[PDB]
Structures are given as C-alpha cells and as structure tokens.
Amino acid sequence: MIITDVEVRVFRTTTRRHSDSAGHAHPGPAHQVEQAMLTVRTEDGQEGHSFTAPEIVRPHVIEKFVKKVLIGEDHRDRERLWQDLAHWQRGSAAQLTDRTLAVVDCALWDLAGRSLGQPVYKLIGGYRDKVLAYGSIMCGDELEGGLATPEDYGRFAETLVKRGYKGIKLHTWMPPVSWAPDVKMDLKACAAVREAVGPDIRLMIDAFHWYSRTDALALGRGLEKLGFDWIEEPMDEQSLSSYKWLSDNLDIPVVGPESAAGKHWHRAEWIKAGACDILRTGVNDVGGITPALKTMHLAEAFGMECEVHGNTAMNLHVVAATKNCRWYERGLLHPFLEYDDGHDYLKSLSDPMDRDGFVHVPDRPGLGEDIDFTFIDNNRV
Numbered sequence: 001m002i003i004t005d006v007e008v009r010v011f012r013t014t015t016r017r018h019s020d021s022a023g024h025a026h027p028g029p030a031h032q033v034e035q036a037m038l039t040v041r042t043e044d045g046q047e048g049h050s051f052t053a054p055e056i057v058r059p060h061v062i063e064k065f066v067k068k069v070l071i072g073e074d075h076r077d078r079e080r081l082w083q084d085l086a087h088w089q090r091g092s093a094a095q096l097t098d099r100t101l102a103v104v105d106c107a108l109w110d111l112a113g114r115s116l117g118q119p120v121y122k123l124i125g126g127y128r129d130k131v132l133a134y135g136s137i138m139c140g141d142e143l144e145g146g147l148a149t150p151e152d153y154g155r156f157a158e159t160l161v162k163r164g165y166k167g168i169k170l171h172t173w174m175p176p177v178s179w180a181p182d183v184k185m186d187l188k189a190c191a192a193v194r195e196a197v198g199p200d201i202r203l204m205i206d207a208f209h210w211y212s213r214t215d216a217l218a219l220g221r222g223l224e225k226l227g228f229d230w231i232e233e234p235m236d237e238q239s240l241s242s243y244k245w246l247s248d249n250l251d252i253p254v255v256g257p258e259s260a261a262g263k264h265w266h267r268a269e270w271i272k273a274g275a276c277d278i279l280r281t282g283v284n285d286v287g288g289i290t291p292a293l294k295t296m297h298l299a300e301a302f303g304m305e306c307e308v309h310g311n312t313a314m315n316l317h318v319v320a321a322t323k324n325c326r327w328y329e330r331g332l333l334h335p336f337l338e339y340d341d342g343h344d345y346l347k348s349l350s351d352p353m354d355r356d357g358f359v360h361v362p363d364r365p366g367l368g369e370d371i372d373f374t375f376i377d378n379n380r381v
C-alpha cells in the first residue's frame with residue numbers, strides 16, 4: 001500500500017469554455033486547453049487520479065513539495081499526509097496552494113476507492129445516492145441571445161426548468177464586462193427569472209464578488225421582494241466584519257465564505273462571528289475532500305447547512321456523504337453550451353441528472369471518473 005510514484009500528465013482538451021482576465025467563465029470559440037491529470041501509484045500497481053490546471057501541479061510544486069510528502073508513505077494515511085502538506089504551506093513562498101492540496105487529497109481518495117473497488121462516498125459513509133442539483137448559470141456577458149440582458153436570463157431559466165432543475169442560481173455581470181457591475185441590472189435579471197419560473201422554483205444569486213457595503217445592501221434589499229433563497233458572496237470575503245454587518249441588515253440568507261482562505265479553521269470563525277446564515281465550502285476552496293468533510297461536520301454541529309461549491313465528482317461525493325447540504329452545484333451553464341455532453345477526456349458523465357432534477361452518483365470505484373486514458377495519451381502536451 002506504499003506510494004511509489006507521483007506523476008503528472010498534461011494533455012489538450014477541446015472546449016468552448018473560456019475565462020476572461022478576471023477569471024470568469026464564458027462561452028467562446030472551440031479551442032484546445034491544457035489540462036493536467038495527477039496520478040498516485042502504489043507498490044502493487046494500484047492507481048488514483050485527479051484533474052486540475054497545469055500550473056497547480058507543475059514540476060516545481062511536485063518536486064519540492066508533493067513527492068517529498070507522499071513517496072514511500074502508506075497511501076491510506078490521508079490525514080497524516082494532508083497535515084504534512086498543510087504544514088509546509090506557510091514556508092512555500094506562496095507556491096504550495098490549497099489548490100495543490102486539493103488535487104493530491106482527491107487522488108489519494110480515488111486511489112483508496114479504486115484499490116478497494118468502492119465509490120468514495122460509500123467509503124466515507126454514504127447518506128444519499130442521488131441529490132437535487134441547481135442549475136448554476138455562468139457570469140453575464142455581452143453576447144446577443146446569450147446572457148447579455150435581464151430577459152436573456154429569464155429565457156435561459158425557462159429552459160433549465162424544462163430540463164428538470166428545481167433550483168437555479170444566477171451569476172450576474174462582472175468586469176471586464178464594459179458597464180459592469182450594476183446593482184440595478186443584477187436586480188432586473190433576478191426579477192426577470194422570478195417572473196419566468198414562478199414562485200415554486202428556488203432561486204439564488206451570486207453577484208459581483210466585491211460590491212461595497214452600500215451596494216450589497218441595495219442588492220439584498222431588492223432580492224427581498226423576489227423571494228430568493230440566498231445571496232452569495234456579494235462583497236470581498238476578506239472582510240468578515242462586512243458580512244456580519246450585511247447579515248444583520250438583510251432578511252435573505254447570506255451564504256459563505258466561498259473563496260476565503262483558511263480552510264475549515266476560517267470557516268469556524270465565520271460561524272463564531274455570525275458572518276453568514278448558511279456556510280459554504282468546496283473541495284478546491286478548502287484543500288480537498290478531507291477538509292471539505294471537516295467543514296460539513298463543523299456546520300452540522302451548529303445545526304447549519306454547508307453548501308458545496310463546484311461541480312465534478314470530488315464535490316458530488318462530499319454532497320452524497322453528508323446530510324446538511326441542500327444541493328449539488330451543476331454548472332456552470334450557458335444557453336450556447338450543452339453541459340450534458342460532458343468532457344472529451346471522460347467516457348461518461350460524473351454527474352448524470354434525471355428529468356426530475358436529481359443527480360445520481362455513479363456506481364463506480366473511487367471518485368468514479370470514467371477516464372478515457374487513450375484520449376489523454378493521444379493528446380499529450
């Protein structure tokens with residue numbers, strides 16, 4: 001069960017998903033994007049895999065940090081290995097990130113699952129085999145017929161309800177969109193969606209992540225008359241105090257923190273200070289499945305829900321293994337893209353959804369990602 005190799009394979013995936021200068025996703029021309037796959041192998045030849053961006057698992061990080069911690073170690077000692085990596089972050093000159101911790105932890109979970117022939121959520125201790133998912137809409141754009149106007153969001157929302165989604169979350173306009181951000185426009189989009197889907201579909205909004213306190217209050221107040229389930233990260237999450245203030249001034253539930261650093265430790269501070277009404281976590285945000293589970297348990301002890309940020313198997317398994325999370329986040333979605341088509345490097349979807357809005361966790365070992373190793377080999381960088 002001893003780890004003998006840690007390898008990274010970079011390949012090209014064909015996609016229409018682009019990201020602007022601020023990191024927001026948008027649909028664009030079909031192009032090839034470099035993707036990396038991390039593989040951990042043991043003495044007996046068993047392997048575990050996980051995907052991430054090339055820079056996160058580049059040679060510098062693999063040689064200086066990851067191999068030194070994993071090679072020659074019992075792969076099942078996930079807590080000891082995660083803690084070893086966490087301990088080296090402070091002195092890593094800012095290069096050993098939570099993102100690197102997440103991919104390594106995920107590969108370790110996949111390795112244990114594949115080695116035992118067990119789905120990761122079943123190994124953790126399963127709670128549910130299927131879970132409701134909300135359609136998470138991409139940030140706004142300036143594409144005619146895409147997500148350029150409030151009406152465009154309303155029209156896309158109708159399409160998502162038809163698909164089966166019981167919940168819908170809007171990500172509104174953000175720079176570099178020429179005129180963004182604009183609280184009034186964001187509210188018009190929210191109103192358009194509510195008008196289009198009716199009062200029975202659950203709605204949420206994840207607007208510009210850096211609004212001032214005054215703008216966030218105006219946004220939240222406008223959401224009141226629309227009956228939205230929650231307002232997500234409307235202000236810079238580095239300001240815990242701003243969230244304590246905003247929560248005390250809004251009726252609508254505030255969910256967070258999504259992007260704030262500090263992993264589960266910082267999440268505890270948000271609970272202690274009453275900075276949110278619903279907690280938030282994510283495998284990529286807190287450094288892996290291991291710390292994500294800790295954040296779920298933390299929230300549960302306070303009788304709170306903890307909504308998991310992000311799609312893909314790693315997050316789906318956390319959701320399936322816990323009770324205090326209302327949804328699995330399926331997206332990001334856009335009218336110009338067909339999410340159900342999947343990825344070219346995966347033979348099947350990790351998160352198939354039925355016509356009733358329930359995603360069914362695949363009955364496959366580990367994270368259950370149906371990897372097309374042949375495609376990856378044929379498209380190596």
Ligand SMILES: [Mg+2]
Nearest residue numbers: 206232233258
């Ligand atoms: Mg968000």
